[PDB]
Amino acid sequence: PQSEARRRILETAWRLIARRGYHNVRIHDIASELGTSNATIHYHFPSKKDILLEALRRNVKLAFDRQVAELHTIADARERLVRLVELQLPTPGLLRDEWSVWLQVWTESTLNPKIRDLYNDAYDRWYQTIAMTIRTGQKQGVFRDQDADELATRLSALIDGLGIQVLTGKRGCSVDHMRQHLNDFIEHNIVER
Amino acid sequence: QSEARRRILETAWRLIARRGYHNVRIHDIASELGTSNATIHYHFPSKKDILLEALRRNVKLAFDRQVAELHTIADARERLVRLVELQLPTPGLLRDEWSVWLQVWTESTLNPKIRDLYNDAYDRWYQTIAMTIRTGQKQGVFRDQDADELATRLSALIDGLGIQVLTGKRGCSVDHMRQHLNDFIEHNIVER
Ligand SMILES: C[N+](C)(C)CCO
Ligand SMILES: C[N+](C)(C)CCO
């Protein structure tokens, strides 16, 4: 009843924030899209920053559930790492929108401590996932010996950089090109020769 | 009057870097300088014109800075390490520049004049890195691996690490980013 009103507001706000930008989304844009009042929205989220914070929290959870679903039947660490990286591509739809929002979060983080803390915890979880995957492939003998933390740092960084090049329209860049670049890095920098 | 626009842009640049473009109202610029929203619009008809002219000014200053630093350097390995050092978000001017760039990546995905400006700027920088790699390959100090893909890799790595710095990743610092990049150059670019 009320938890349902919240989720709908957040789902709508996420999409609007992704496609129009957080500072260009007004409360009445959300209320119009859903048929509610500005007052209902204010009741659940007294400030716009609260809509962003709670929308991010909901999405980090959705995204992690997606990850769990995609990987649970995968035991080979190369296949796991390949899938993990695939889940990070800004493919058409929800993943492209998530990227759109994360780019905004990088900036808003430099200014809002709750957003900064949420982004860091979400980042850290991913970072540990990557590092853990590396150490499994190392134990399985399919990945080269190398410090997994430095490698998780590098892979994560490479991914974010490439995504920017996709979103900002760098000439020759596409999701297929990013995919190819990242698969080349895995095959030549991570996989055991 | 060339002096009034100058002050406006330098002030707007600093406020955008520190407060964020969407949080800077026109009266905020006026108060930092002592003037009115009207005078500000007199020189910049829209808020978006302020961001655009400021960015143009910055891109130029940064390219100048780069030419001054690379001027004499013949050795490609040294040129490359210097190019990379210029991208570090060191406290003060460079960190402020990164802050604006971060906003520009987002505004690019929505505004064409800004996307155009960012792509011409990024392409210049990217070709520079490419060129330098090819130089070191010819001099014999760098591994003969496709320079476009290496430059794509190094540029992406730079952006990603900068983000980790600016957003506060645990254990991240400007010096750690420097070491990571130098290690990338030394172990991935330089010829064993
Ligand atoms: C790689 N992404 C930016 C999509 C997620 C980080 O949380
Ligand atoms: C973020 N950099 C400073 C690397 C370049 C932006 O034009």
From TrEMBL, chain A:
Domain of life, source organism: Bacteria
Residue ranges constituting the HTH tetR-type domain according to the UniProt record: 3-63
Keyword Transcription regulation: yes
Residue spans binding DNA: 26-45
Keywords: DNA-binding, Repressor, Transcription, Transcription regulation
Protein name: Transcriptional regulator
Record carries keyword Signal: no
Taxonomic path: Bacteria, Bacillati, Actinomycetota, Actinomycetes, Pseudonocardiales
Entry's Gene Ontology molecular function annotations: DNA-binding transcription factor activity; transcription cis-regulatory region binding
Coverage span on the entire protein: 93 to 285 of 287
